[PDB]
């Protein structure tokens, strides 16, 4: 499979612009990752400003972002684990658990944008 890469061309406070290459603009409400040396930072696609440029919302601390870091697509929306393995554990919005009780294993992953 191929990845979709993009450049971060504007960090305006807490909103991040990605300039992509052609035929790789993700649809609305599709997550994006960017690998800081601290952790991974999640972004959510909100608008298409034209010119293959997509304006996104942060999901964690948008400090430290150099311009032009290469964001990686993840195709679908933000995924959370479901099922009866999530019980009794503390999950944030991106799904990465923070009770320090290991990762959450489950057969399914789900989007947080359904009809």
């Amino acid at each position: 499979s191929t990845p979709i890469t993009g450049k971060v061309t504007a960090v305006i406070g807490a909103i991040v612009d990605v300039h992509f290459e052609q035929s790789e603009l993700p649809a609305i409400l599709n997550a994006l990752e960017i690998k800081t040396p601290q952790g991974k930072l999640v972004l959510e696609v909100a608008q298409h400003l034209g010119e293959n440029t997509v304006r996104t919302i942060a999901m964690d601390g948008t400090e430290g972002l150099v311009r032009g870091e290469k964001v990686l697509d993840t195709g679908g929306p933000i995924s959370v684990p479901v099922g009866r393995e999530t019980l009794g554990r503390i999950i944030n919005v991106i799904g990465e658990p923070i009770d320090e009780r290991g990762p959450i294993k489950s057969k399914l992953r789900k989007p947080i944008h359904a009809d």
Partner: protein, 187 residues
């Protein structure tokens, strides 16, 4: 210290171009190449004009630029590079406007002080010639610089004539004089 300011309304691209080429002499060539690219846009009107649309791409604008320069190798030097910037800046649509403005700056460097002799009907040539001479035999033009001159037809005026150039004008026509006669006799 460049001549004839563009100032504001997108002639600054031309301004940059002018001053960047002013220090490297080659302006007439630049001007000629602008004439040639404007003509080869005009002499290929389907998608030479109608492919100056904002909805294309970054890449397709760049390849139109490449398609445009494919017709002629070594397009001057500076005006082939400026297009790339504009292609990347996507200000291509407001482009022949830049051609006209660079033309204005260029023929200002020549000193062609374009004028006008407005009327409500076109006139003989003898009047044209005598006025052009007068305008050339004038303070206005300091000589060493030319003097175009265009008669235009204006129905909104009732006749007469008005001379125009260097944001300096004289109107001895009919409409304004009727106006003034009326105003003074309408008390």
């Amino acid at each position: 210290p460049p001549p004839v300011r563009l100032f504001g309304v997108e002639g600054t691209y031309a301004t940059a171009l002018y001053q960047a080429a002013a220090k490297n002499s080659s302006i007439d060539a630049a001007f000629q190449s602008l004439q040639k690219v404007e003509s080869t846009v005009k002499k290929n009107p389907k998608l030479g004009h109608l492919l100056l649309n904002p909805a294309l791409s970054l890449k397709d604008r760049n390849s139109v630029i490449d398609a445009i320069v494919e017709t002629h190798k070594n397009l001057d030097g500076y005006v082939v590079n400026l297009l790339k910037v504009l292609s990347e800046n996507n200000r291509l649509g407001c482009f022949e406007k830049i051609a006209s403005d660079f033309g204005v700056l260029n023929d200002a460097h020549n000193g062609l002080l374009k004028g006008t002799v407005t009327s409500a009907e076109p006139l003989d040539p003898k009047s044209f010639k005598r006025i052009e001479k007068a305008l050339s035999a004038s303070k206005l033009v300091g000589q060493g610089k030319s003097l175009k001159l265009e008669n235009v037809v204006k129905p909104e005026i009732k006749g007469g004539l008005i001379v125009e150039l260097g944001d300096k004008t004289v109107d001895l026509s009919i409409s304004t004089k009727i106006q003034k006669l009326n105003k003074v006799l309408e008390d």
